[PDB]
């Protein structure tokens, strides 16, 4: 966890508290990180 996930990449909790990431690109929505 040195670098920060890929910019444009938006830490967004839901309406029941799981912190998502919001990509601005796509808009991909998940709950996962785009990373391991």
């Known amino acids: 966890?040195?670098?920060p996930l890929p910019?444009?990449?938006e830490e967004?909790?839901?309406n029941?508290?799981?912190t998502y990431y919001?990509?601005?690109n796509n808009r991909s929505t998940?709950?996962?990180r785009p990373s391991l």
């Open 1 to 3: 966890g040195s670098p």
């Open 7 to 9: 910019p444009g990449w």
């Open 12 to 14: 967004k909790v839901d």
């Open 16 to 18: 029941l508290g799981r």
């Open 22 to 24: 919001v990509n601005h």
């Open 30 to 32: 998940q709950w996962h």
